């Protein structure tokens, strides 16, 4: 048999498999907005 190195370590690296991943944005589960009908004290629907 061949005396293979135990490849317990990454030096290639997997960075081709890594930066291909586009990372989710899940900071706030309702998508980063406070959902409120009271804090719209203002409205652009008025003129103009």
């Amino acid at each position: 048999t061949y005396p293979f190195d135990q490849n317990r370590f990454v030096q290639y690296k997997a960075t081709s498999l890594e930066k291909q991943h586009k990372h989710d944005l899940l900071t706030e589960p309702d998508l980063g907005v406070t959902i409120d009908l009271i804090n719209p004290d203002t409205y652009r629907i008025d003129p103009n």
């Binding site: 706030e28 589960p29 309702d30 406070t34 959902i35 409120d36 009908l37 009271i38 804090n39 004290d41």
Partner: protein
């Protein structure tokens, strides 16, 4: 704005509180309630505190405005349900900006109990269903229920 009016009992429409300075909210409860002032002013200065960049004294001074639903007001219980839906929405909102020390439930309890008194007088407000629908997203369940109560809002 930066100073709106606080009406008196006798020779009303005379005194003002300028909001550029920050008075303590508890003495505000006093200087309002020795004057038997209408509940609307409590909402108005709550909005003043909120536009002053305050979310916590804003939400706790209104707890002192939960006592005076119809004190001398001649059926301003519509004004009390408007008061109480603000706490039913902003307790659960301030629970989402939770800190390292308290629990989410440390505000959800007060939100849920006060919502029960909010539904004693009035049912299916445009914010009643919001409070329980946004209550659902916190726990990851009753999610289609939350969507249904939001669609109850559109109908």
């Amino acid at each position: 704005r930066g100073s709106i009016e606080i009406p008196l009992r006798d020779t009303d429409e005379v005194i003002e509180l300028d909001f550029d300075q920050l008075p303590e909210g508890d003495e505000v409860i006093s200087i309002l309630k020795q004057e038997h002032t209408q509940l609307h002013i409590w909402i108005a200065l709550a909005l003043e505190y909120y536009k002053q960049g305050k979310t916590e004294e804003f939400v706790k001074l209104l707890e002192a405005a939960r006592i005076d639903g119809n004190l001398d007001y001649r059926d301003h219980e519509k004004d009390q349900m408007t008061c109480l839906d603000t706490l039913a929405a902003y307790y659960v909102q301030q629970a989402r900006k939770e800190k390292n020390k308290d629990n989410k439930k440390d505000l959800i309890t007060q939100a849920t109990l006060l919502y029960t008194m909010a539904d004693k007088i009035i049912m299916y407000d445009q914010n009643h269903l919001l409070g329980r629908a946004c209550f659902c997203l916190l726990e990851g369940d009753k999610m289609d229920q939350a969507d249904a109560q939001f669609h109850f809002v559109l109908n």
